[PDB]
Design an enzyme around this catalytic site. Structure first.
Site, PDB file in Angstrom:
ATOM      1  N   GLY A  25       0.775  -1.239   0.000  1.00 29.03           N
ATOM      2  CA  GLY A  25       0.000   0.000   0.000  1.00 29.03           C
ATOM      3  C   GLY A  25       0.806   1.288   0.000  1.00 29.03           C
ATOM      4  O   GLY A  25       2.028   1.275  -0.196  1.00 29.03           O
ATOM      5  N   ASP A 139     -11.774   4.307  14.313  1.00 30.24           N
ATOM      6  CA  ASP A 139     -11.883   3.813  12.935  1.00 30.24           C
ATOM      7  C   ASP A 139     -12.321   2.324  12.859  1.00 30.24           C
ATOM      8  O   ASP A 139     -11.648   1.506  12.219  1.00 30.24           O
ATOM      9  CB  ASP A 139     -10.594   4.085  12.117  1.00 30.24           C
TER      10      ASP A 139
END
Length: 295
Positions: A25, A139
């Protein structure tokens, strides 16, 4: 308050080996690997995360390591240790089935009512632990729920303890108020994610209009496989008044009641003859799981 006596384990680069890259990523690269300690005659399946060397990124990777090392719960991801090479490496338990969001999208034709309800309990259990620890996730989403075995999930990415509005509570969006009750709203959207087998919440609708949508009283739709019993819970998680929303100890209990008779609460076509991978003919030389290795 109480001193944090957590042990930060420093590991030698020579004690572990990278087998294959799992994800490269924007933050860095995550590898599947094995950790072979000293002369312990054990191989632990690990996920090794590494990062250029900008002093800002090293600071964020070590703040993440701090939190991860400060937790211990069967439904919360733990950090095994850190390796201090030229670029800091975080060593953690391997979760072979990836995140729950991908798993439900990829295995929808085999996810039965038992699994879905068990996951809901498991997530509430981890969240209630984070609550006891006075740790607010900020989150929580199906993408941040990792899968050890199809029958055992653990919460991750609480290295927030860029904003995901569509999972955020009302006080979070307007006033930036993050509480354990704000995480209950995110839990509600997560349950919705599972129940819709990985559907994107408020799909097509932009992030700006969300605040007004919620303030008017509009919520996520009722998933077809959901009885009014399960949906009422999701709806209760999405209330303006945070004190009115359920507590995670209540969610454990509620979903546990439902998990005892899963077909009364989730109506899945063909759920009875489904079954997912489990310890049968495979699923799995001196390899031991991190949950069984303690020094």
């Amino acid at each position: 308050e109480a001193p944090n006596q957590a042990l930060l384990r420093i590991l030698k680069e020579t004690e572990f080996k990278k087998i294959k890259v799992l994800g490269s990523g924007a933050f860095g690269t995550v590898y599947k690997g094995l950790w072979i300690p000293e002369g312990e005659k054990v191989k632990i399946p690990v996920a090794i995360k590494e990062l250029a060397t900008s002093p800002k990124a090293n600071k964020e990777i070590l703040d993440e390591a701090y939190v991860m090392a400060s937790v211990d719960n069967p439904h919360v991801c733990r950090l095994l240790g850190i390796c201090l090479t030229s670029t800091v490496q975080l060593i953690m338990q391997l979760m072979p089935f990836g995140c729950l969001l991908d798993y439900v999208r990829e295995h929808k034709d085999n996810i039965g009512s038992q699994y879905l309800l068990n996951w809901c309990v498991q997530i509430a259990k981890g969240m209630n632990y984070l609550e006891d620890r006075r740790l607010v996730h900020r989150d929580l989403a199906a993408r941040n729920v990792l899968v050890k075995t199809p029958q055992h999930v653990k919460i991750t990415d609480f290295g927030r303890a860029k904003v995901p509005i569509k999972w955020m509570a009302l006080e979070s969006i307007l006033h930036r108020i993050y509480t354990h009750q704000s995480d209950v709203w995110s839990y509600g959207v997560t349950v919705w994610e599972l129940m819709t087998f990985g559907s994107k919440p408020y799909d097509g609708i932009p992030a700006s209009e969300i605040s007004s949508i919620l303030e008017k009283g509009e919520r996520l739709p009722q998933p077809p496989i959901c009885t009014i019993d399960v949906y009422m819970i999701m709806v209760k998680c999405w209330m303006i008044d945070a004190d009115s929303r359920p507590k995670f100890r209540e969610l454990i209990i509620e979903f546990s009641k439902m998990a005892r008779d899963p077909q009364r609460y989730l109506v899945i076509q063909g759920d009875e003859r489904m079954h997912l991978p489990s310890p049968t003919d495979s699923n799995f030389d001196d390899v031991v799981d991190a949950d069984e290795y303690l020094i």
